[PDB]
Design an enzyme around this catalytic site. Structure first.
Site, PDB file in Angstrom:
ATOM      1  N   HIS A 179      -8.828  13.964 109.351  1.00 46.27           N
ATOM      2  CA  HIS A 179     -10.254  13.834 109.619  1.00 46.27           C
ATOM      3  C   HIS A 179     -10.977  15.062 109.078  1.00 46.27           C
ATOM      4  O   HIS A 179     -10.546  16.190 109.341  1.00 46.27           O
ATOM      5  CB  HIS A 179     -10.505  13.685 111.117  1.00 46.27           C
ATOM      6  CG  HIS A 179     -11.899  14.036 111.534  1.00 46.27           C
ATOM      7  ND1 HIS A 179     -12.990  13.253 111.225  1.00 46.27           N
ATOM      8  CD2 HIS A 179     -12.381  15.090 112.234  1.00 46.27           C
ATOM      9  CE1 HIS A 179     -14.083  13.808 111.716  1.00 46.27           C
ATOM     10  NE2 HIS A 179     -13.741  14.924 112.334  1.00 46.27           N
ATOM     11  N   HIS A 196     -18.765  19.346 101.689  1.00 43.72           N
ATOM     12  CA  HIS A 196     -19.198  19.588 103.061  1.00 43.72           C
ATOM     13  C   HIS A 196     -18.249  20.541 103.780  1.00 43.72           C
ATOM     14  O   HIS A 196     -18.677  21.535 104.382  1.00 43.72           O
ATOM     15  CB  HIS A 196     -19.287  18.245 103.789  1.00 43.72           C
ATOM     16  CG  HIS A 196     -19.890  18.319 105.155  1.00 43.72           C
ATOM     17  ND1 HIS A 196     -21.217  18.623 105.368  1.00 43.72           N
ATOM     18  CD2 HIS A 196     -19.357  18.086 106.377  1.00 43.72           C
ATOM     19  CE1 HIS A 196     -21.469  18.601 106.664  1.00 43.72           C
ATOM     20  NE2 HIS A 196     -20.359  18.270 107.299  1.00 43.72           N
ATOM     21  N   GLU A 197     -16.947  20.260 103.708  1.00 40.44           N
ATOM     22  CA  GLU A 197     -15.973  21.086 104.417  1.00 40.44           C
ATOM     23  C   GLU A 197     -15.901  22.495 103.837  1.00 40.44           C
ATOM     24  O   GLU A 197     -15.812  23.479 104.585  1.00 40.44           O
ATOM     25  CB  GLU A 197     -14.598  20.422 104.389  1.00 40.44           C
ATOM     26  CG  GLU A 197     -14.577  18.990 104.903  1.00 40.44           C
ATOM     27  CD  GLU A 197     -15.391  18.808 106.167  1.00 40.44           C
ATOM     28  OE1 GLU A 197     -15.123  19.516 107.160  1.00 40.44           O
ATOM     29  OE2 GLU A 197     -16.301  17.954 106.168  1.00 40.44           O
ATOM     30  N   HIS A 237     -18.819  24.428 104.932  1.00 44.63           N
ATOM     31  CA  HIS A 237     -18.572  24.893 106.293  1.00 44.63           C
ATOM     32  C   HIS A 237     -17.706  26.145 106.289  1.00 44.63           C
ATOM     33  O   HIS A 237     -17.979  27.104 107.020  1.00 44.63           O
ATOM     34  CB  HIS A 237     -17.901  23.794 107.115  1.00 44.63           C
ATOM     35  CG  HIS A 237     -18.843  22.743 107.603  1.00 44.63           C
ATOM     36  ND1 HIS A 237     -20.040  23.042 108.217  1.00 44.63           N
ATOM     37  CD2 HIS A 237     -18.758  21.391 107.582  1.00 44.63           C
ATOM     38  CE1 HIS A 237     -20.655  21.921 108.547  1.00 44.63           C
ATOM     39  NE2 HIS A 237     -19.897  20.905 108.174  1.00 44.63           N
ATOM     40  N   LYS A 250     -36.595   1.462 124.321  1.00 42.50           N
ATOM     41  CA  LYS A 250     -36.045   1.193 122.997  1.00 42.50           C
ATOM     42  C   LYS A 250     -36.944   0.257 122.202  1.00 42.50           C
ATOM     43  O   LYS A 250     -36.930   0.282 120.965  1.00 42.50           O
ATOM     44  CB  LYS A 250     -34.640   0.603 123.133  1.00 42.50           C
ATOM     45  CG  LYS A 250     -33.905   0.392 121.821  1.00 42.50           C
ATOM     46  CD  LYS A 250     -32.520  -0.186 122.058  1.00 42.50           C
ATOM     47  CE  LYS A 250     -31.507   0.908 122.345  1.00 42.50           C
ATOM     48  NZ  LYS A 250     -31.501   1.945 121.279  1.00 42.50           N
ATOM     49  N   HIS A 259     -21.168   9.962 122.460  1.00 37.55           N
ATOM     50  CA  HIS A 259     -21.874  11.171 122.877  1.00 37.55           C
ATOM     51  C   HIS A 259     -22.760  10.908 124.091  1.00 37.55           C
ATOM     52  O   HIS A 259     -23.924  11.298 124.138  1.00 37.55           O
ATOM     53  CB  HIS A 259     -22.692  11.721 121.714  1.00 37.55           C
ATOM     54  CG  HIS A 259     -22.045  11.533 120.376  1.00 37.55           C
ATOM     55  ND1 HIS A 259     -21.046  12.360 119.909  1.00 37.55           N
ATOM     56  CD2 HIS A 259     -22.259  10.615 119.405  1.00 37.55           C
ATOM     57  CE1 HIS A 259     -20.671  11.958 118.708  1.00 37.55           C
ATOM     58  NE2 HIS A 259     -21.391  10.901 118.378  1.00 37.55           N
TER      59      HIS A 259
END
Ligand SMILES: *[C@@H]1O[C@H](CO)[C@@H](O[C@@H]2O[C@H](CO)[C@@H](O)[C@H](O)[C@H]2NC(C)=O)[C@H](O)[C@H]1NC(C)=O
Ligand SMILES: *[C@@H]1O[C@H](CO)[C@@H](O[C@@H]2O[C@H](CO)[C@@H](O)[C@H](O)[C@H]2NC(C)=O)[C@H](O)[C@H]1NC(C)=O
Ligand SMILES: *[C@@H]1O[C@H](CO)[C@@H](O)[C@H](O)[C@H]1NC(C)=O
Lengths: 247, 596
Positions: free
Chosen positions: B327, B356-357, B360, B463, B487
């Site tokens: 992942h 992206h990684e 980071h 909503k 979340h």
């Protein structure tokens, strides 16, 4: 040895070759502050002092004149007018351990800044507050000595580096260590100028048959003019004749 | 021997051993995530509690220091991390009950079980299958049935569980001198230091929607366009006055409209910007992709990648018995250790993910010079926004052509530009309303002024105004539809996703202006402009040493949040939408429903 227990060595009464180490690519850092490395082989002092240890990679810049830091103040200090050189090279392959090079330790806390060319090996518990740390560590207690967490994967900054600093002292006593002199070859029957073992002069050199006693180095006939020499290597007597001249 | 120097010495003693232990724990975690085996499992325990067995004691001894007079703001801020009560303020029974309820709610949410009545011996989970089938299809019956079943077998038995979780979290919020757990979450965007840079928890509540209303004319327009496409896709299922149900958004929550993008394609005549065929033809392995990402990063202005990362970190295909989860993650193991964990393959998507990684990782190195307790971003969203900046800039057609992904004689026009812009907006601006409404609903539920009855139905009308969703099947009190989300039960602040998009848009816009580029924002390229990368690294090196408001001052000129980049980016899409859905009227009605 440890950074706060830096290994101290005195060197005297030998010939020291500096270009041999200078012309080596195995040293990551080679910083000379006294003179240029090439010129070092010419002049010489009466003794040499070597401080050897291994530190963290990021701390190598701390060991320099006019430089401050934890190592530079509580482990080992050098003066602003230090004469000599510093040689450092990576020891990640050797000093750093897969299980952790925790054998090495550094002084993190000390009451006062260390003096140049001074060593402190005190293991007394440090106090940061008003409460007296009577033996066992309490609230305001911190150990001056902290180990090292060297690992195979710690980044370049954390790799242990072996650092040796050489300083030179030239006290009024006669010098004992100097660089190599280098000698050329020898010619004969030709008007040349020579500097035999510090004795200089021009002329033509021939083979002679005088018999020096085993301890003279040269000879003069009268009015103190040199006439013969003994070569320092082959140990044979050569005769000197002035180069021809006239009106 | 003033207490300030005592605190400094305590921090000096603490940080070295904390860094060593954190490095050991992170190394073990990376090893297990690279070597999936039982042996690497127990090691976690052997470190895990030990971390607490080191941290809690330091937290235990971080109370008698009077953290109210230290002149050094950095020292006080660093010590504040250790001077946290945490959940230990609660009694042991309360803490263990909270832990048990969190465990059971997470397990039941992650173990969703729905069996089709025709074949009751074969259920389906949140893993691909039912979600995959319903998210990519053209139907109303199966999608609605799957949505109802999922909301029934996760919502029925989690309503009291989520109620008890919320009330106990709020109780421990008062246990830590917080009137609300919403304020506890908002404390990340809370600073009371330098004058003119301080921010308050209460202000953020209104500031979140202050930058949200401006996208309402745009988003609704897309919805209107979507509704237009709905009248071209769903016959007599969505009224033009009303809006679409929950299961017709493409996802059971409708967070993104990517699953509905194919239905609402603006111009399918022009193929999308794809060069994966070129990399397959040109044999672009993981090494080439990483090398090109590194070269583009250097061209931007960030320092070149260091060694060690290229050997220890895994790059592609765990493969054999040596299995590994890949992942996309960037591991900052500490003590100068940075690694990647992601299955890089021959795809532009994999190119963007690697960008992206590694961005980071670069940001982690940027604040790596900070102490152990300051080696983090100013807030949660900055890390992900910075990571996404380079991925956004690595997909621009000019960048692809420069490194020869596109053909050297490629020619883009307005049709593909509009198609790509709408495709991006269907997820970027199509998720801001849902994110904002979910964050607000969580704010009320943590604050608790709404009764337990005002949980479902209020949501199902709220909503309507924000996301524009009608009720496909009724839900009064027998489920917890909002609470059945990833979340919502893992105690994850949902405002991070809202803030990340705005932050990345602001940073990309500021870089585009201060990068010597002309033209639209979507085609902007920051390659070979080292000044932009230098300014970006100036922002990044601050880390946690500076407040987030003060952090938002180098690349961008605004310390607060603004919506101007969001409207500026989707300008061609907005002007196409203005004259596109002229026949229909913008906006949705909250009274119409599929059943009525
Ligand atoms: C200085 O070193 C040279 C190099 O070895 C010495 O020269 C050799 O000495 C050995 C000693 O038995 C002889 O066998 C060789 O024939 C010498 N090589 C020559 C002359 O080319 C030299 O003797 C040394 N000087 C001393 C010892 O005073
Ligand atoms: C990061 O980029 C710099 C700039 O090119 C690299 O520095 C040179 O790299 C080339 C090829 O990579 C070498 O042939 C040179 O010897 C390097 N010169 C110097 C002064 O370093 C640097 O090597 C790159 N970093 C890594 C880890 O490859
Ligand atoms: C992975 O873990 C297993 C189980 O301990 C072990 O046998 C194997 O050697 C490990 N492989 C690596 C590369 O660490």
């Amino acid at each position: 040895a440890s950074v706060y227990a830096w290994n101290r060595k005195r060197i005297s009464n030998c010939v020291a070759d500096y270009s041999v180490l200078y012309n080596s690519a195995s040293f990551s850092t080679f910083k000379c502050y006294g003179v240029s490395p090439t010129k070092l082989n010419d002049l010489c002092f009466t003794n040499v002092y070597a401080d050897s240890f291994v530190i963290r990679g990021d701390e190598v810049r701390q060991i320099a004149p006019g430089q401050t830091g934890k190592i530079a103040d509580y482990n080992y200090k050098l003066p602003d007018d230090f004469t000599g050189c510093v040689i450092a090279w990576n020891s990640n392959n050797l000093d750093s351990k897969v299980g952790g090079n925790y054998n090495y330790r550094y002084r993190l806390f000390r009451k006062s800044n260390l003096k140049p060319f001074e060593r402190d090996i005190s293991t007394e518990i440090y106090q940061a507050g008003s409460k007296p740390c009577n033996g066992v560590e309490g609230f305001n207690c911190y150990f001056p000595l902290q180990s090292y967490g060297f690992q195979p994967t710690n980044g370049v900054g954390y790799q242990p580096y072996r650092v040796v600093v050489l300083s030179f002292e030239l006290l009024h006593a006669p010098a004992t260590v100097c660089g190599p002199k280098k000698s050329t070859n020898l010619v004969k029957n030709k008007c040349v100028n020579f500097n035999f073992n510090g004795l200089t002069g021009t002329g033509v050199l021939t083979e002679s048959n005088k018999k020096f006693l085993p301890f003279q180095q040269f000879g003069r006939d009268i009015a103190d003019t040199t006439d013969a020499v003994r070569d320092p290597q082959t140990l044979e007597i050569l005769d000197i004749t002035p180069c021809s001249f006239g009106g | 021997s003033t207490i300030e120097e005592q605190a400094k010495t305590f921090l000096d003693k603490f940080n070295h051993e904390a860094e060593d232990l954190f490095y050991q724990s992170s190394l073990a975690s990376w090893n297990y995530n690279t070597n999936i085996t039982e042996e690497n499992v127990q090691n976690m325990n052997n470190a895990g509690d030990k971390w607490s067995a080191f941290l809690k004691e330091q937290s235990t001894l971080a109370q008698m220091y009077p953290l109210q007079e230290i002149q050094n703001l950095t020292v006080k801020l660093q010590l504040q991390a250790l001077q946290q009560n945490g959940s230990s303020v609660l009694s042991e029974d309360k803490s263990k009950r909270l832990n048990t309820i969190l465990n059971t709610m997470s397990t039941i949410y992650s173990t969703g079980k729905v069996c089709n009545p025709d074949n009751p011996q074969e259920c389906l989970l949140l893993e691909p299958g039912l979600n995959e089938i319903m998210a990519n299809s053209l139907d109303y019956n199966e999608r609605l049935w799957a949505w109802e079943s999922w909301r029934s077998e996760v919502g029925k038995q989690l309503r009291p569980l989520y109620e008890e979780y919320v009330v106990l979290k709020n109780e421990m919020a008062r246990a830590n001198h917080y009137e609300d757990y919403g304020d506890y979450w908002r404390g990340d965007y809370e600073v009371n230091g330098v004058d003119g840079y301080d921010y308050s928890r209460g202000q953020l509540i209104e500031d979140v929607e202050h930058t949200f209303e401006e996208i309402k004319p745009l988003y609704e327009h897309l919805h209107a366009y979507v509704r237009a496409k709905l009248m071209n896709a769903y016959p007599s299922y969505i009224s033009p006055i009303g809006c679409l149900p929950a299961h017709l958004l493409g996802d059971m929550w409708g967070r993104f409209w990517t699953n509905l993008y194919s239905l609402t394609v603006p111009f399918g005549q022009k193929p999308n910007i794809d060069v994966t065929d070129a990399m397959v033809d040109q044999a672009w392995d993981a090494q080439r992709i990483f090398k090109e990402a590194e070269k583009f990063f250097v061209s931007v202005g960030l320092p070149n990648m260091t060694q060690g990362f290229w050997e220890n970190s895994m790059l592609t295909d765990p493969g054999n018995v040596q299995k590994a989860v890949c992942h996309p993650t960037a591991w900052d193991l500490g003590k100068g250790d940075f690694r990647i964990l992601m299955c890089t393959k021959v795809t532009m998507d994999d190119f963007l993910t690697a960008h992206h990684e590694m961005g980071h990782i670069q940001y982690d190195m940027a604040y790596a010079a900070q102490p152990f307790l300051l080696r983090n971003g100013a807030n949660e969203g900055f890390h992900e926004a910075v990571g996404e900046i380079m991925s956004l800039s690595a997909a621009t057609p000019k960048h692809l052509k420069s490194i020869g992904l596109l053909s050297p004689d490629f020619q883009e026009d307005n049709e593909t530009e509009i198609n790509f812009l709408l495709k991006q907006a269907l997820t970027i601006v199509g998720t801001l309303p849902f994110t904002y409404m979910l964050e607000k609903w969580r704010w009320m539920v943590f604050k608790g002024e709404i009764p337990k009855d005002q949980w479902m139905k209020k949501w199902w009308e709220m909503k309507r105004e924000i996301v524009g969703v009608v009720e496909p099947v009724p839900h009064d009190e027998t489920y917890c539809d909002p609470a059945s989300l990833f979340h919502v039960s893992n105690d994850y602040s949902f405002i991070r996703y809202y803030t990340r998009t705005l932050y990345q848009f602001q940073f990309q816009e500021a870089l585009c202006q201060a990068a010597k580029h002309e033209g639209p924002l979507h085609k902007c390229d920051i390659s070979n402009s080292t000044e932009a990368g230098q300014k970006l690294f100036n922002m990044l090196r601050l880390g946690k040493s500076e407040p987030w408001t003060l952090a938002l001052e180098n690349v961008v000129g605004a310390k607060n949040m603004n919506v101007r980049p969001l409207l500026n980016y989707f300008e061609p899409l907005f002007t196409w939408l203005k004259d596109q859905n002229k026949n229909s009227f913008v906006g949705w009605s909250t009274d119409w429903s599929p059943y009525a």
